[PDB]
């Protein structure tokens, strides 16, 4: 698979893992 | 930063959660 | 002054300092 | 991350440029 997280996939990965903490931006 | 670490390269969960908050 | 950089001011600060490098997101 | 470092607290230029790229 592609194991890189770029753009909107990086955004989604952060939603996921950061949860309630949140993330920039 | 995160783009070099996670997009350009491959990052772990641990590295990624460092860009939380 | 406010020395905190939050939201769109954090975005602008990153535009500024990161220049051609760019920044997430 | 950047929000804790730069928004919640006050960050330097050096800390900020670490969130470039």
Helices (H) and strands (E) in chain D, counts: 2, 0
Give ∠ CA B6-A13-C17 in degrees, rounded to 5: 50
**Resolution of the structure, angstroms:** 2.2
ω into residue A25 within 30 of 0, thus cis? yes
Would you state the structure tokens that stand for residue B13, as one six-digit string? 């969960």
Is the Cβ pair A22, D2 closer than 8 Å?
no
Alpha carbon C11 to its chain centroid, in Å, reads: 4
Q: Which of B12, B5, D20 is nearest to D2 (CA)?
A: D20
Subunits adjacent to chain B (3 or more Cβ pairs under 8 Å)? A, C, D
Is the Cβ pair B2, C22 closer than 8 Å?
no
> Using CA atoms, how far apart are residues A12 and C22, in angstroms rounded to an integer?
20
Is residue C14 within 8 Å of D19, Cβ to Cβ? yes
> Using CA atoms, how far apart are residues D10 and A3, in angstroms rounded to an integer?
34
Does an H or E element contain A15, and which?
Answer: helix A8-18
Sort out which chain A residues have CB atoms less than 8 A from B19's CB and list them.
14, 18, 23-24
């Amino acid at each position: 698979v592609n194991q890189h997280l770029c753009g909107s996939h990086l955004v989604e990965a952060l939603y996921l893992v950061c949860g309630e903490r949140g993330f920039f931006h | 930063g995160i783009v070099e670490q996670c997009c350009t390269s491959i990052c772990s969960l641990y590295q990624l959660e460092n860009y939380c908050n």
